[PDB]
């Protein structure tokens, strides 16, 4: 009876920016998501293919926990089927995405009165992007990687909303993560 | 949470030697370990940040290297005032926590 290391991705000091999101492959875990769901300190807990009370008792083989920092106004548009300034240049989901997206308000950490100029988002691209793909290419398009201008008093839609995106996946392999 | 084990618990050095120290973890962190030094009954200071860089006001022999999960603080040709208690604390996950502690003692 070993439990999955969710503490290394839910409890981190510096979440990476949106264009260079950290991916952590999870296998051979036991993941009790009732500790996550019944915390009630998250803002938007949307699920997109499993019911949020039903997700405990079914198995999987590998679940990817993507994680990044976006503006609060753009948390809704990382759902499937929506394309905006974020969801075609930085992180785009497929239309049959199987997983839950978890987000909360994080104005405590990532805010400075002069600015927090280190979270970067890819403003301009040559063409659009294929889902589940990243590109750290800081070449001239016009410098594309502008930073979020963050502040403690900027707007409840412009506070940094640290979002971790689960991604369940079941392939032709013996499923392990059941709980 | 991480716990940080320093080993060994004490040292015994003569002035002028090149002896290194050891701080090992229980999780794998991306070089987010710092290093503190506290003398007797006063406040500790910062020596190096992010386990490889260094700040001003520090003597040149105080340099650390190595990332991953096992980290070593390297001091060479020590001075007669560098002895005391030495600390390592990580900054990746929460809550923040410091090591148990070693004692640099001069023979």
């Amino acid at each position: 009876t070993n439990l999955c290391p969710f503490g290394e991705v839910f409890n981190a000091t510096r979440f990476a920016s949106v264009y260079a999101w950290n991916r952590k492959r999870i296998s051979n875990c036991v993941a009790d998501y009732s500790v996550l769901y019944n915390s009630a300190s998250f803002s938007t807990f949307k699920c997109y293919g499993v019911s949020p009370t039903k997700l405990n008792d079914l198995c999987f083989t590998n679940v990817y926990a993507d994680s990044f920092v976006i503006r609060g106004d753009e948390v809704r548009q990382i759902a499937p089927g929506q394309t905006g300034k974020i969801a075609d240049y930085n992180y785009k989901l497929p239309d049959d995405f199987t997983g839950c997206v978890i987000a909360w308000n994080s104005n405590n950490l990532d805010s400075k009165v002069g600015g927090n100029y280190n979270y970067l988002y890819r403003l301009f691209r040559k063409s659009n992007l294929k889902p589940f793909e990243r590109d750290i290419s800081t070449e001239i398009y016009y410098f594309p990687l502008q930073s979020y201008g963050f502040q403690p008093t900027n707007g409840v839609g412009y506070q940094p909303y640290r979002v971790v995106v689960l991604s369940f996946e079941l392939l032709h392999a013996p499923a392990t993560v059941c709980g | 949470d991480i716990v940080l084990t320093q080993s060994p618990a004490t040292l015994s050095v003569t002035p002028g030697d090149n002896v290194s120290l050891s701080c090992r973890a229980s999780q794998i962190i991306s070089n987010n370990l710092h290093w503190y030094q506290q003398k007797s009954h006063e406040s500790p200071r910062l020596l190096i940040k992010y386990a490889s860089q260094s700040i001003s006001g520090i003597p040149s022999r105080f340099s650390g290297s190595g990332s991953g999960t096992d980290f070593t603080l390297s001091i060479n040709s020590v001075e007669t005032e560098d002895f005391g208690m030495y600390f390592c604390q990580q900054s990746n996950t929460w809550p923040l926590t410091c090591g148990s502690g070693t004692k640099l003692e001069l023979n």
């Epitope: 990532d110 009165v113 927090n116 | 910062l46 900054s91």
Partner: nanobody, 119 residues
Framework: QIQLVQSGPELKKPGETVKISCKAS????????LNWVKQAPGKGLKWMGW????????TYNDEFRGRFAFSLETSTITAYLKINNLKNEDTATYFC????????????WGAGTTVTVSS
């Protein structure tokens, strides 16, 4: 100069409530939050949780959940520590550390108040 001037020593009896001050100077107070460190004698340090230096909301550790409070007023540059229901084992020095809001290394420290409790 940049320093964190502290309060003096204390001596209480079990059942009282202490208020330890920690006043900053020099650097602008909004760029860097503050911390608290409890050094039990002959032991390692423990991080008592930080405080957001602008808004005033604390964030405690998972071990110092009850019986603690991180008050703050910003008219004068002064942050408090309030300890409720003092017991026999809380006798330690209590530094306050200027840990940043983007780095979390305790760069510039204070002096520390060696509080003691006795019957």
């Amino acid at each position: 100069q940049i320093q964190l001037v502290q309060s003096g020593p204390e001596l209480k009896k079990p059942g009282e409530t202490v208020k330890i001050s920690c006043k900053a100077s020099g650097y602008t107070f909004t760029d860097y939050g503050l911390n608290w460190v409890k050094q039990a004698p002959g032991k390692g340090l423990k991080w008592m949780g930080w405080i957001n230096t602008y808004s005033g909301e604390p964030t405690y550790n998972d071990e110092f959940r009850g019986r603690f409070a991180f008050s703050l007023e910003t008219s004068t540059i002064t942050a408090y520590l309030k300890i409720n229901n003092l017991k026999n084992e809380d006798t330690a020095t209590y530094f306050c550390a200027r840990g940043g809001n983007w780095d979390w290394y305790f760069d510039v420290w204070g002096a520390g108040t060696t509080v003691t409790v006795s019957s």
